[model samples]
Target: SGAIYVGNYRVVNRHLATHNDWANLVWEDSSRDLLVSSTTAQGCDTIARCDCQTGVYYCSSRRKHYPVSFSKPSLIFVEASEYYPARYQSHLMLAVGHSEPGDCGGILRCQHGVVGIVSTGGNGLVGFADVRDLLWLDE
Candidate 1:
């Protein structure tokens, strides 16, 4: 009984995996490693990866008005996904929320164990709480 704060801007980012929308037809399969279709925008878009063991996610759609753009296009999965929620660790943050009102929208922090990208928006809403230590939830 501890998961109902749904008010931090109405919390949203339920991407389970596989996405498309944004010009359509971007490619990357790597024999099933996945990375197909890329061009995101239009409601909720927070993507992360520490290897995505099986939560399954290959996003796209986030570029309709622009403000928070890490060059768009993203991917992450170094191996970790026992259905997620082990307090959610391994550097991953992808958020998108802008239906007007200051055009609020941002997030995208994929560290992948120091492989690259350790910050992007820092937590204004997108990904990685703005990128620092990646993740350390012990509460």
Candidate 2:
């Protein structure tokens, strides 16, 4: 994902991070961090995903016109939670308050550094996947 893409011109510093979970896949760009960093996944203010689906739309599947509404804001405040797969210690279940569906893969940030990525959640709370283990640079 080079910043410049000139036709027939060679580009350098192409990078990508892919995951089975598409939401975690991030394209390499100028906004990326140059070095690896970690943050404790507790008591942090996460810049959580804000996918407020408020916009114009044309639905052809159901073949009808519908109106969209403004969605509620996002959330923060992380904490320990139940583990997934029951036996997987690396799950590192971290929960954030005030999240809803479709907020997965939201980058959780703290005063120190990046903490986690949103995994899944309901209207009440959301879970985060530890970013420490996610592959970087896709090299």
Candidate 3:
């Protein structure tokens, strides 16, 4: 299996639910650390760890792992049960980084646009909170 994977993945806020109707469900684990989550684009509830002491983010999810660095990420994967339970989907991912610049700013802008696509209903609706964050307030 020498095939090279040149795809990209999106971190689905793994602990939070997303929906276009009613209120999106939420999953909370007392064991999860937000700081650790910042290390990964994989979301939360993993057994991974980070050696860095800065703690701006902790790499504490083990269904997947990526080196801790300021260089930028190139891949994301794995499942942790925290991955999904009694849910239709855990996270949404797609092949990313095909047509974007590699510099820090370029990657950030590209990522911002890609994340916008997911947070806004795959480019459907606007405003944050999964289409429900705002509409639910009105409802």
Candidate 4:
């Protein structure tokens, strides 16, 4: 069993009120353990860690806000298991967006990096493979 490591990257948006929401890419080691993690300042006093392998998450501290909202986040990963069943080389990406108007969302990738900013009125899809050359890639 190996480990997975995750790192965060902050996407720049000049039109947004706060570039809070960040993206993360997980890297796994030979033992299937997390190596490191990265993130951006979202103006919150708390931080949290998510275990994508086990589908569990926990917060290190607690913070409060005026309003709270929960949105479905997309998970992206490379499909290496097809090639190697007992061992594989792959990574995971997670992205979240704001639900309010005028806000934006983003997509992260372990291979090509952060794809682009998801517009407030726009939506996108997440796939396990790289299909940038296909016409359906945009779909």
Number of the top-ranking candidate, with TM-score as the measure: 2
Clashing pairs in 3: 8-96, 35-58, 36-58, 46-61, 46-62, 47-61, 47-62, 48-60, 48-61, 48-62
Best by lDDT: 2
Where does the lowest 10-residue lDDT sum fall in candidate 4? 57-66
TM-score rank order? 2, 4, 1, 3
Candidate 3 stretches with Cα past 4 Å from truth are: 1-14, 18-55, 58-68, 85-139
- CA-lDDT, candidates in order: 0.26, 0.31, 0.19, 0.24
RMSD of each: 16.4, 14.6, 17.1, 16.5
Per-residue lDDT over 17-135 for candidate 2, one digit per residue giving the tens place of the 0 to 100 score: 22321232233222211112222232223222333223222223233323333223223333333422222223333332544333443444443334444444445544444332333
Clashes of 3: 10
Angstrom error at residue 41, model 1: 24
Off by over 4 Å in 4: 1-10, 17-103, 108-110, 122-139
lDDT of 1 at 76: 33
Which has the better TM-score: candidate 1, or candidate 2?
A: 2
Cα lDDT for residue 93, candidate 3:
27
Model 3 scores worst on lDDT over the 10 consecutive residues at: 1-10
Residue 125's lDDT in candidate 1 = 35
RMSD of 3: 17.1
